[PDB]
Structures are given as structure tokens and as C-alpha cells.
Design an enzyme around this catalytic site. Structure first.
Site, PDB file in Angstrom:
ATOM      1  N   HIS A 351       0.915  -1.011   0.109  1.00 32.18           N
ATOM      2  CA  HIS A 351      -0.022  -0.055   0.151  1.00 32.18           C
ATOM      3  C   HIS A 351       0.703   1.428   0.018  1.00 32.18           C
ATOM      4  O   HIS A 351       0.207   2.310  -0.031  1.00 32.18           O
ATOM      5  CB  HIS A 351      -0.968   0.187   1.200  1.00 32.18           C
ATOM      6  CG  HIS A 351      -1.787  -1.032   1.198  1.00 32.18           C
ATOM      7  ND1 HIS A 351      -3.169  -1.086   0.726  1.00 32.18           N
ATOM      8  CD2 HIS A 351      -1.774  -2.327   1.846  1.00 32.18           C
ATOM      9  CE1 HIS A 351      -3.896  -2.086   0.936  1.00 32.18           C
ATOM     10  NE2 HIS A 351      -3.187  -2.953   1.594  1.00 32.18           N
ATOM     11  N   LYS A 542      -8.245  14.212   3.796  1.00 27.40           N
ATOM     12  CA  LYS A 542      -7.393  13.331   3.909  1.00 27.40           C
ATOM     13  C   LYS A 542      -6.452  13.405   5.097  1.00 27.40           C
ATOM     14  O   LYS A 542      -6.245  14.437   5.721  1.00 27.40           O
ATOM     15  CB  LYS A 542      -6.350  12.740   2.612  1.00 27.40           C
ATOM     16  CG  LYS A 542      -5.645  14.090   2.046  1.00 27.40           C
ATOM     17  CD  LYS A 542      -5.874  14.573   0.833  1.00 27.40           C
ATOM     18  CE  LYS A 542      -5.455  13.306  -0.352  1.00 27.40           C
ATOM     19  NZ  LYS A 542      -6.486  12.884  -1.216  1.00 27.40           N
ATOM     20  N   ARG A 543      -5.553  12.108   5.303  1.00 25.64           N
ATOM     21  CA  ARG A 543      -4.733  12.314   6.683  1.00 25.64           C
ATOM     22  C   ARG A 543      -3.620  13.372   6.173  1.00 25.64           C
ATOM     23  O   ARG A 543      -3.332  13.609   5.164  1.00 25.64           O
ATOM     24  CB  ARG A 543      -3.995  11.261   6.869  1.00 25.64           C
ATOM     25  CG  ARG A 543      -4.866  10.307   7.675  1.00 25.64           C
ATOM     26  CD  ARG A 543      -5.010  10.592   8.888  1.00 25.64           C
ATOM     27  NE  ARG A 543      -4.352  10.690   9.944  1.00 25.64           N
ATOM     28  CZ  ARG A 543      -4.020   9.702  10.637  1.00 25.64           C
ATOM     29  NH1 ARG A 543      -4.662   8.601  10.743  1.00 25.64           N
ATOM     30  NH2 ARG A 543      -2.901   9.925  11.756  1.00 25.64           N
ATOM     31  N   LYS A 548       0.947  14.606   0.653  1.00 27.22           N
ATOM     32  CA  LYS A 548      -0.285  14.631   0.378  1.00 27.22           C
ATOM     33  C   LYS A 548      -0.414  16.372  -0.051  1.00 27.22           C
ATOM     34  O   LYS A 548      -1.174  16.705  -0.620  1.00 27.22           O
ATOM     35  CB  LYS A 548      -1.480  14.400   1.350  1.00 27.22           C
ATOM     36  CG  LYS A 548      -1.627  12.846   1.238  1.00 27.22           C
ATOM     37  CD  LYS A 548      -2.237  12.316   2.530  1.00 27.22           C
ATOM     38  CE  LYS A 548      -2.538  10.922   2.707  1.00 27.22           C
ATOM     39  NZ  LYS A 548      -3.446  10.154   1.691  1.00 27.22           N
ATOM     40  N   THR A 650      -8.132   6.538  -2.379  1.00 25.87           N
ATOM     41  CA  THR A 650      -9.511   6.129  -2.488  1.00 25.87           C
ATOM     42  C   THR A 650     -10.426   7.243  -2.395  1.00 25.87           C
ATOM     43  O   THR A 650     -11.522   7.197  -2.929  1.00 25.87           O
ATOM     44  CB  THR A 650      -9.857   5.086  -1.448  1.00 25.87           C
ATOM     45  OG1 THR A 650      -9.678   5.289  -0.198  1.00 25.87           O
ATOM     46  CG2 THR A 650      -9.197   3.794  -1.867  1.00 25.87           C
ATOM     47  N   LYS A 654     -14.131   8.442  -4.389  1.00 29.12           N
ATOM     48  CA  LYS A 654     -15.422   8.872  -3.553  1.00 29.12           C
ATOM     49  C   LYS A 654     -15.879  10.137  -4.287  1.00 29.12           C
ATOM     50  O   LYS A 654     -17.079  10.312  -4.466  1.00 29.12           O
ATOM     51  CB  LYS A 654     -15.124   8.826  -2.036  1.00 29.12           C
ATOM     52  CG  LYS A 654     -14.541   7.760  -1.579  1.00 29.12           C
ATOM     53  CD  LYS A 654     -14.105   7.923   0.163  1.00 29.12           C
ATOM     54  CE  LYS A 654     -13.443   6.863   0.502  1.00 29.12           C
ATOM     55  NZ  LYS A 654     -12.882   7.059   2.091  1.00 29.12           N
TER      56      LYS A 654
HETATM   57  O1  LIG Z   1      -2.324   3.741   4.428  1.00 32.80           O
HETATM   58  C1  LIG Z   1      -1.486   3.219   3.941  1.00 32.80           C
HETATM   59  C2  LIG Z   1      -0.139   2.649   4.745  1.00 32.80           C
HETATM   60  O2  LIG Z   1       0.829   1.773   3.847  1.00 32.80           O
HETATM   61  N1  LIG Z   1      -1.535   3.441   2.576  1.00 32.80           N
HETATM   62  C3  LIG Z   1      -2.489   3.720   1.636  1.00 32.80           C
HETATM   63  O3  LIG Z   1      -3.553   2.554   1.440  1.00 32.80           O
HETATM   64  C4  LIG Z   1      -4.426   2.969   0.723  1.00 32.80           C
HETATM   65  C5  LIG Z   1      -5.356   1.725   0.443  1.00 32.80           C
HETATM   66  O4  LIG Z   1      -4.739   0.779  -0.466  1.00 32.80           O
HETATM   67  C6  LIG Z   1      -3.978   3.871  -0.774  1.00 32.80           C
HETATM   68  O5  LIG Z   1      -5.111   4.288  -1.170  1.00 32.80           O
HETATM   69  C7  LIG Z   1      -3.211   5.008  -0.278  1.00 32.80           C
HETATM   70  O6  LIG Z   1      -2.737   5.573  -1.585  1.00 32.80           O
HETATM   71  C8  LIG Z   1      -2.168   4.663   0.797  1.00 32.80           C
HETATM   72  O7  LIG Z   1      -1.237   5.654   1.166  1.00 32.80           O
END
Ligand SMILES: O=C(CO)N[C@@H]1O[C@H](CO)[C@@H](O)[C@H](O)[C@H]1O
Length: 810
Positions: A351, A542-543, A548, A650, A654
């Protein structure tokens, strides 16, 4: 009320009211003279839950009878949000419950606002797990979510004087009507101890035992009567624990601390022992459950035909040596056969490519905590490196790069390397991310085993992320194309033939303005803030992270402000700029970005010359339930991560699904979203991945941009001089220092093209009909980004199972 919310039949409404009053009386032990809205919420929750259990028992019975291949989704995070409305939606009860509660003199929306989010995740990764569970149930897979029942989920964010304050998310305070404790399925998890070698194998002895107690939550499929299980483990001390007396009893807390709290880091690895315990805890307890279920249907050759284990990131990577341990030490399989079983059972989803996010556990931690697992990891490493040596003879640096054990001051285990070695499939979460994996960080592994590497572009569930949060849009779509798209989101393409339909244009634009008014009202009612609902809703939620680039958004916001101050009597498209998200408690820079945002708002929102032409709002406590409110209200989605950093995103999807246009870099899933909608219908700007690479080779000099862009220079001068912090003139010196000298994410490099692209957004917004026609083109092509599509791809290409839209008997 509206079609997609289901039928409100006389008999069901009557029965719901009946059972509502029963639960209020018998379950909650209240008369209605003393009942509060929370009591009402709970009576409704229990009433709806009653409708699940029949389907839940029969689904799980069905799986026992038909013995399909089982999917185990292992995640340390499940960011579920609220469950009431989602359950109603999937059970087709929403209108009936709305009618039943209205007749009891209650507003169901108001009751829904009482439910605490299950905030058992940090962000994207946790929410992906939640969407995935929904899609798996909807697609009739025998799937189980396995994780930790954290007593405290992601902290509640309070803003005090512009600063983030964290408070414990005591989400279980009033109870959780959705979960069912299963104390009878309690399993032992072992920690510490030592390894004893006997004539007949290794033995892990002198361990400290922590009990794992499961709590089952129902996961309903969309109107298919399938209810799957999310099983979350709770840590419990054994009864002989430390058994002067009083203290022994109080020290039970040490064992139970394991499931106490979610680590609040998004995309950052903290090498803490408690975190490792959490990771092993979920893995050990889950694997025992998996094996128990497998035996209750000696021959483990069929194990991979009956079991798939999906590792959600490296967090549950210990599943690999734990499976080996059980197979080798306990079941007495030979290593090579156990390894074959393990590899064919396990698959790994990556991820992130951010180095600091990668899990690299110090060997001394594993030595103490999990001595047998370390031994297994070494053995795995040696056999794996022998394979590399045989494939790439004489390539000594490859051996070093590919080792699971990384050398240095402290030796560490690279958990990603462990995952790749011990899995038959490795996937990224967007095509560009998956390519980056094969070309950069896992290039060596790709060259050894190209067949392992796959892509599974992320998705979001259209149930929560359209039907639930945007019923108005769901309705106007269903009017033209029917209801089938909710479980087959590709059908939204049919909306392309309505792009010139004047009635539809009007309706799309109407649903948006309604959402914007409802959200503008939410802001006033719950946070006492004044916004123009006619303005462009420019949102970035987002976080908080440097990658970001909330800071790049900040720079644009300041640019707009300065331009207004420069030419006050010139027309500008009014904007409400909304930025929200949590910073990890120890991430100082992220906390400074929040302060900056609120500080900008302080200046901008109180400047009389600006008026209601520009508003800067920091959305406090961004979380799933807030996402459901703000996303349908957005016009512009900010997806502005430096190219190559956001694995997928994601939130972007949305926003696409809910009628916002996207301003974004060619990063993560943005690339595929632009591809789907057409680049003409996307506000693409900034460096591509290749440009970032070219810049890195050359060396990134932020000063160059400062020197050559007068508007950017002014902003930096303003920040440094204390324009946005009069009392603390040097408050933002860190931010300036970072931007000028150590900006890993090249904020300045994208500034010009970003501002320019933002002008094109404002230009389009000036023409409502053409804005809306572009919106229709986005919504119409958002089909690919359904997690149903994602999960069908996992099912077929990784797990070897066929999804099914066929109903179970009600
Ligand atoms: O939260 C994390 C830590 O690896 N990664 C995030 O995972 C999400 C689901 O796959 C992705 O959409 C994000 O881009 C990614 O930072």
C-alpha cells in the site's frame, strides 16, 4: 420516500414499530417518558440487527455445508464507520425504518447521528478493508475480516487555538449493538519464552500466554441475504496471570493493553514492541481459527485449496512464519511441504512506496518476543537467498538487497521482503503503483519471480459511497437507468447518453446544490461557522502528510487571497476552501500544517475586503461519518500528492462518484480516473513520475522557484515575516525552512502549474452547464472504481474463487 431506499410495506412498518417498542422496553429497560434519543437509536439498532441474525446464521451454516474456499482478510485496521444506515441499505429496510420511526414520532436521520464511528483505522488502508468486506459479502464470497477490537480507535481531533488536540476515542462507552462477543472461542497467544530443540523437533517453551477473545460483527452483502463475519480479537489475561494479590490482579492490564489502542500513524512505521505484539496477536489467533475451521470440514496439501490469506500490508506479515511454525513444529510437516502450503495460501498487498512507512523490525525485538519466529525467518531467508544465488550467480549485491535480514548498526527484518518470499501473489493498489513496485523498490524480486507481481486497482463501495451518503444522486440516476448499477457500477456508463439531457443536467446540479446547502447548514449547526453555499466547494480531506501536499493547497489559497488584496474590485469565482484530516500525534510537521491552515483562515475569513469571496475552513475530526457528509457536497476534489507517492488514494474515487471534479497530479489511481473519464474531463497538472525522477537526478533546488516566481516569493516572505502569525512572527519558520531546504515532495516545483490549473477550474465553474456536463462525464465513467470490480479481480486472479450475485434464501 425515494425508490432506492426500498419498500415501506404496511406489514413491515407495523412489525418494525412492534420490535422497536419491544427493544426499548425489554432490551434497554426504559419507558418512553424517560427515553433519550440515544435510547431510541439503540432500540432502532437492535431492531435492525434482529433482521441480520437469521441471514447471518444461515450464511455461516451454508459455508459449513458447501465447504467453499475461504478468504481470510487479515488487517490491523478496519475503518467501518457507522453501521446502522449501511445495514438498512443492504437489507432494503431504509424506507420501512424511516416510516416506522416517523410513525413513532422520531426522525431517523437524527437517530443515525448518535451512532459512534467504528474508527478502527487510520485512513485509506483501513477504509479499503471496510469497502472490501462489503464487496466480498455482496459478491457472495466466503470471506472473513480478521483484526483487533481496539478499545480506542483513531483519536478524536479537537482544534484548540488552531492546534490539534487528541482525545481518546472511547467508542465502546455506550456499548456496541453490532458485535457479538464469543468468549467460548477464546484462544491462547504466546509471547517471549525460548526455543528448545528435542530429538523430535523444536519446541517453543516458557511462554507468557495472552488470551484472544473474538467479537463477531455481521457484514451484510447488498440485498443478497449474505451476511459475512468480521472477527475482531480482544486481549484478555489468563486467570492464573501473575497468580501481592491486589497487584497481580491489577497487572492483568499489561496483557490486555495489547488490544487497547490503535496506533495513529498513517504511512509511518514506529518500531514499538506493543505494535509488534498487536501484529502477532491478531496473526496467531487468526491462524488457529483458520486451521480449526479447516480441520472441521491431517492432509494439509488441500489447505491452499480451502484457504486464502490476504495480508493487508506487512502488518500481518507474521502470518507467514506463524503458518510455518504451526505446520512444522506442531503438525510435523517437513519444511519444503509446509513452505509450499504457506506460499500458495498467502498473498500480499502493498500500500506504499514511502521508505519510512516500511516495516523493518529490529532483530533484538523478535529475538525476545518471538524467538521461534526469528529462527523460522532466518531459515526462510537462507533458502530464499540460495534460490537467488542459483538464479543470479555471483551477484553478491543482489543477495544483500534481497535479504530479509538487513545489515547495519541494528539488524532488522524487512517484512516486505518476507511477504514477497512467502506469498504466491504480490499486488499494488493502482497500475502506476504496481509498476513502480516492479521497476524500483521490488525490482530484484520481480526479476526473480515476475509471475508473483500483479495489480489490483483500489475501489470504494458504491453502497456506502453513493447510495448511503448521496441518496439524491442515487435516486436521479436510478430514475433513468434503474437500480442495477448499485451492484454493477459499470452500468453508470449509460449516463453518457444523458450528457446533453437538459432535465438530467438540472437534476445533477440540483442534487449538488442541495448537498451543499445541507452541509453549509451542518457547519453552522454543529460548528457555528458562516459559508456561502453558492461558492465553489474546494475540498481536500485526507490524513495530514507532507506527501499529500496540503501545503501546496495552502500556497494556492494564499495566492488567491493576495490576488484579491491586489485587485479587490475584480471578480473572482467565490470559493469555500475546506481542508480536513488528522495528523499523527508525533508528526510535528503535520501538526504545523494544521496550524498554518487555521492561521490562514484566521486572516482570510476576517478580512472585510475579501467578503464571502474566499473562505478557509479546517474541517475538524475528519472521519468516515464526516466523509459521508462533505464528499457529496464537494465541487472540487484536491488530489495533489507528488507524483509517485500516493499508492492509489480512494478519497479521489469517492469524490468522482459524488459529482465533484478532480484537480490532481498523475499519481496513484488519479491516472486511471483520468483515463476512464478522459483527460479533457480532469484537471491534471504538475510533474509526472518521470519529471520527478529527472528533477531528483538533477537535484531539487527550491530556491530556483522562489527566485523566479514573484507570487511564490511574496507568500514565503509573508510566512517568514509573521503575516499569518502576528504574535509569534517566527511560528512557521520550520515550514519555510522545510520548503526552502528539505522538501522531499517538491511543493514549489508544482506551484505554478497548480495555480494555472486552478484558474481553469474557476473558469469552468463560471459556466454551470458545462461544469455539470463534465461532472456527468466523471460520474458516468466512475464504474471501474467500485470495490466490487477490485474484489472480483482478487477473487479470480489471486484467490481462485468465483464471485456470485445470486441470493441466499431469506
Ligand atoms: O495507509 C497506507 C499505509 O501503507 N497506505 C494507503 O493505502 C491506501 C489503500 O490501499 C491507498 O489508497 C493510499 O494511497 C496509501 O497511502
Amino acid at each position: 420516500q425515494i425508490s432506492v431506499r426500498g419498500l415501506a410495506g404496511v406489514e413491515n412498518v407495523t412489525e418494525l414499530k412492534k420490535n422497536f417498542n419491544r427493544h426499548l422496553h425489554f432490551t434497554l429497560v426504559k419507558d418512553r417518558n424517560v427515553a433519550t434519543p440515544r435510547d431510541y437509536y439503540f432500540a432502532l439498532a437492535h431492531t435492525v440487527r434482529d433482521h441480520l441474525v437469521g441471514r447471518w446464521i444461515r450464511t455461516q451454516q451454508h459455508y459449513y455445508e458447501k465447504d467453499p474456499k475461504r478468504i481470510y482478510y487479515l488487517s490491523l485496521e478496519f475503518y467501518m464507520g457507522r453501521t446502522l444506515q449501511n445495514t438498512m441499505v443492504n437489507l432494503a429496510l431504509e424506507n420501512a425504518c424511516d416510516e416506522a420511526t416517523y410513525q413513532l414520532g422520531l426522525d431517523m436521520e437524527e437517530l443515525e447521528e448518535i451512532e459512534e464511528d467504528a474508527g478502527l483505522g487510520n485512513g485509506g488502508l483501513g477504509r479499503l478493508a471496510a469497502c472490501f468486506l462489503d464487496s466480498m459479502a455482496t459478491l457472495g464470497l466466503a470471506a472473513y475480516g480478521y483484526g483487533i477490537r481496539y478499545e480506542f480507535g483513531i483519536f478524536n481531533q479537537k482544534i484548540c487555538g488552531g492546534w490539534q488536540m487528541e482525545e481518546a476515542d472511547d467508542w465502546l462507552r455506550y456499548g456496541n449493538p453490532w458485535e457479538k462477543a464469543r468468549p467460548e472461542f477464546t484462544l491462547p497467544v504466546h509471547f517471549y519464552g525460548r526455543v528448545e530443540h528435542t530429538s523430535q523437533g523444536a519446541k517453543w517453551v516458557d511462554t507468557q500466554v495472552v488470551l484472544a477473545m473474538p467479537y463477531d460483527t455481521p457484514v451484510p452483502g447488498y440485498r443478497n441475504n449474505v451476511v459475512n463475519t468480521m472477527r475482531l480479537w480482544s486481549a484478555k489475561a489468563p486467570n492464573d496471570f501473575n497468580l501481592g494479590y491486589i497487584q497481580a490482579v491489577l497487572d492483568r492490564n499489561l496483557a490486555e493493553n495489547i488490544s487497547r489502542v490503535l496506533y495513529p500513524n498513517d504511512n509511518f512505521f514506529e518500531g514499538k514492541e506493543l505494535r509488534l505484539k498487536q501484529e502477532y496477536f491478531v496473526v496467531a489467533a487468526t491462524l488457529q481459527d483458520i486451521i480449526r475451521r479447516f480441520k472441521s470440514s491431517t492432509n494439509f496439501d488441500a489447505f491452499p485449496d480451502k484457504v486464502a490469506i490476504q495480508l493487508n500490508d506487512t502488518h500481518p506479515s507474521l502470518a507467514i512464519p506463524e503458518l510455518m511454525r504451526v505446520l512444522v513444529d506442531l503438525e510435523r510437516l517437513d519444511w519444503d511441504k509446509a513452505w509450499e502450503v504457506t506460499v500458495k495460501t498467502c498473498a500480499y498487498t502493498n500500500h506504499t512506496v514511502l521508505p519510512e512507512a516500511l516495516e523493518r523490525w529490529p532483530v533484538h525485538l523478535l529475538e525476545t518476543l518471538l524467538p521461534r519466529h526469528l529462527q523460522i525467518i532466518y531459515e526462510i531467508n537462507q533458502r530464499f537467498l540460495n534460490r537467488v544465488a542459483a538464479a543470479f550467480p555471483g551477484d553478491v549485491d543482489r543477495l544483500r538487497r534481497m535479504s530479509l535480514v538487513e545489515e547495519g548498526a541494528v539488524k532488522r527484518i524487512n517484512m516486505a521482503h518476507l511477504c514477497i518470499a512467502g506469498s504466491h501473489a504480490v499486488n499494488g493498489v493502482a497500475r502506476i503503483h504496481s509498476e513502480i513496485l516492479k521497476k524500483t523498490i521490488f525490482k530484484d524480486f520481480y526479476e526473480l519471480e515476475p509471475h508473483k507481481f500483479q495489480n489490483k486497482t483500489n475501489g470504494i463501495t458504491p453502497r456506502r459511497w453513493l447510495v448511503l451518503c448521496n441518496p439524491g444522486l442515487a435516486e436521479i440516476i436510478a430514475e433513468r437507468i434503474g437500480e442495477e448499477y448499485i451492484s454493477d457500477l459499470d452500468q453508470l456508463r449509460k449516463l453518457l447518453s444523458y450528457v446533453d439531457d437538459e432535465a438530467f443536467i438540472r437534476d445533477v446540479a440540483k442534487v449538488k446544490q442541495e448537498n451543499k446547502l445541507k452541509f453549509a447548514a451542518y457547519l453552522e449547526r454543529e460548528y457555528k461557522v458562516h459559508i456561502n453555499p453558492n461558492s465553489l466547494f474546494d475540498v481536500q480531506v485526507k490524513r495530514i502528510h507532507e506527501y499529500k501536499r496540503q501545503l501546496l493547497n495552502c500556497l494556492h489559497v494564499i495566492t488567491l487571497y493576495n490576488r484579491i488584496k491586489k485587485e479587490p474590485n475584480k471578480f473572482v469565482v467565490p470559493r469555500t476552501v475546506m481542508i480536513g484530516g488528522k495528523a499523527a500525534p508525533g508528526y510535528h510537521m503535520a501538526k504545523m500544517i494544521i496550524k498554518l491552515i487555521t492561521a490562514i483562515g484566521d486572516v482570510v475569513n476576517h478580512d472585510p475586503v475579501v467578503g464571502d469571496r474566499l473562505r478557509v475552513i479546517f474541517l475538524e475530526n475528519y472521519r468516515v461519518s464526516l466523509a459521508e457528509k462533505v464528499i457529496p457536497a464537494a465541487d472540487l476534489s484536491e488530489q495533489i500528492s507528488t507524483a509517485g507517492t500516493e499508492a492509489s488514494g480512494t478519497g479521489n474515487m469517492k469524490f468522482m462518484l459524488n459529482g465533484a471534479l478532480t484537480i490532481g497530479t498523475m499519481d496513484g489511481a488519479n491516472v486511471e480516473m483520468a483515463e476512464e473519464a478522459g483527460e479533457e474531463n480532469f484537471f491534471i497538472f504538475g510533474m509526472r513520475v518521470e519529471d520527478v525522477d529527472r528533477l531528483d537526478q538533477r537535484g531539487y533546488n527550491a530556491q530556483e522557484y522562489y527566485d523566479r516566481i514573484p507570487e511564490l516569493r511574496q507568500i514565503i516572505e509573508q510566512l517568514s515575516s509573521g503575516f499569518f502569525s502576528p504574535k509569534q512572527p517566527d511560528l512557521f519558520k520550520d515550514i519555510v525552512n522545510m520548503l526552502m531546504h528539505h522538501d522531499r515532495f517538491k511543493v514549489f516545483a508544482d506551484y505554478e502549474e497548480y495555480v494555472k490549473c486552478q484558474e481553469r477550474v474557476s473558469a469552468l465553474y463560471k459556466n454551470p452547464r458545462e461544469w455539470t456536463r463534465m461532472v456527468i462525464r466523471n460520474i458516468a465513467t466512475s464504474g471501474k472504481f467500485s470495490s466490487d470490480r477490485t474484489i472480483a479481480q482478487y477473487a479470480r486472479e489471486i484467490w481462485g474463487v468465483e464471485p456470485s450475485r445470486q441470493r441466499l434464501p431469506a
